[PDB]
Each structure stands twice: as C-alpha cells, then as structure tokens.
C-alpha cells in the first residue's frame, strides 16, 4: 500500500539529447507521501538527478527522513548501471536532494555506453523513508 | 565532485 516504508520506481526520459527544461516523473507513494524523480541538464555538460518529496503540499509542518539510491539504468548490462546514494531530511524548505553532476552528459548520451537507446534514458530511485512527522497527526 | 545537494 501507499504506507509502505520503501519502494523502487523508474522514470524514462525521452528525447534525452534534446533535454532543456527540468523534467518531473509521476509520483510514487511511500509513507503515503508523493516521491518524484527530477532530471535536468546542468553545466549538456552534466546530468542533474534529484529525488523530490511532497513538494506540492502547502504544509510547512511536515518532515521525513529517508535514504535512497539514485540510479541511471544501463540497458545492456545492469552491472554497468551507475548509482549514488543519499541520506536527507526532507521538509518544505528542502524538499529535494541529489546531484547536479550525477554523471557526465557526454557519457550518458554516448551510444556505445549502454545508458541511452532511441534517445531514452531510464532513471531509478530506491527510497527507504522513516515514518513522517507533522503529516498524519 | 558529483555536486550533492538541492536541485537549486
Ligand atoms: Na517512465
Ligand atoms: Na515514474
Ligand atoms: Na526518444
Ligand atoms: Na507536478
Ligand atoms: Na512514478
Ligand atoms: Na508529477
Ligand atoms: Na505509488
Ligand atoms: Na505534495
Ligand atoms: Na513531490
Ligand atoms: Na511541501
Ligand atoms: Na511535485
Ligand atoms: Na508533490
Ligand atoms: Na502547515
Ligand atoms: Na516535522
Ligand atoms: Na522521519
Ligand atoms: Na522527520
Ligand atoms: Na515542512
Ligand atoms: Na523540488
Ligand atoms: Na549511453
Ligand atoms: Na537508461
Ligand atoms: Na524505510
């Protein structure tokens, strides 16, 4: 259910080589809160990859600590998939966390590397969140 | 470094 303490979800970004604006995935519910993958180009140059939590809510009382593994899937060999982990206390003033320089843009878009196919790149997040505070009183 | 931190 949506109350699950952890989950793994993916978001495939299309026309990747042409990415210009920040893109946001649909929400995945963990601890009954909406978690999303955020991707953006940073300086073409590098891949910005972040995990967002409960950003739409106008509440300023909530907080949720979580650990997560942010991964860019290598479709040719999952052992070649690239991942980094984070630990962050999410709340209204700091609702996302990740890496602005997660991977070199030239590497992810290199057709010989196995991360891109038909100009599509798949992002994955495995999030393990603690019980939230200031939400479900 | 990978530039860990908020999207901003
Ligand atoms: Na998708
Ligand atoms: Na998704
Ligand atoms: Na495409
Ligand atoms: Na949205
Ligand atoms: Na989703
Ligand atoms: Na969304
Ligand atoms: Na869900
Ligand atoms: Na929200
Ligand atoms: Na969100
Ligand atoms: Na919020
Ligand atoms: Na959002
Ligand atoms: Na939201
Ligand atoms: Na509030
Ligand atoms: Na709180
Ligand atoms: Na928490
Ligand atoms: Na908390
Ligand atoms: Na808050
Ligand atoms: Na955000
Ligand atoms: Na690639
Ligand atoms: Na991929
Ligand atoms: Na957890």
Which residues is A9 bridged to in the sheet?
A125
Q: Is A7 helix (H, G, I), strand (E, B) or coil?
A: strand
Instruction: Round to whole Å and give the CA distance between A89 and A132.
Output: 10
Is the sign of the CA dihedral A67, A65, B7, A1 positive or negative? positive
Query: Determination technique for this PDB entry?
Result: X-ray
Residue of chain B whose alpha carbon sits nearest to that of A49: B7
Q: Residue A59 Cα, ligand 17 centroid: separation in angstroms?
A: 6
Q: How far is A21 from chain B (nearest CA, A)?
A: 13
CB contact under 8 A, B2 and A22: no
- Nearest-CB residue to A96 (from B2, B3, B6): B6
**Which of A127, A135, A136, A133 is CA-nearest to residue A29?**
A127
CATH of domain A1-137: 2.60.210.10
Instruction: Round to whole Å and give the CA distance between A30 and A48.
Output: 23
Resolution of the experimental model, in Å, one decimal: 1.7
């Amino acid at each position: 259910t949506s109350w699950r303490s952890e989950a793994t979800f993916q978001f495939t970004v299309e026309r990747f080589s042409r990415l210009s604006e920040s893109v946001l995935s649909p929400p995945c519910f963990v601890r009954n809160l909406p978690w999303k993958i955020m991707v953006m180009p940073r300086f073409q140059k590098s891949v910005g990859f972040f995990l967002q939590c409960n950003a739409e809510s106008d509440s300023t009382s909530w907080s949720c600590h979580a650990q997560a593994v942010l991964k860019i899937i290598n479709y040719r060999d999952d052992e070649k998939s690239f991942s980094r982990r984070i630990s962050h206390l999410f709340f209204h003033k700091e609702n996302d966390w990740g890496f602005s320089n997660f991977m070199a843009w030239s590497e992810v878009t290199d057709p010989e590397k196995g991360f891109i196919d038909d100009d599509k790149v798949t992002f994955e997040v495995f999030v393990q969140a603690d019980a939230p505070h200031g939400v479900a009183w | 470094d990978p530039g860990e931190g908020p999207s901003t």
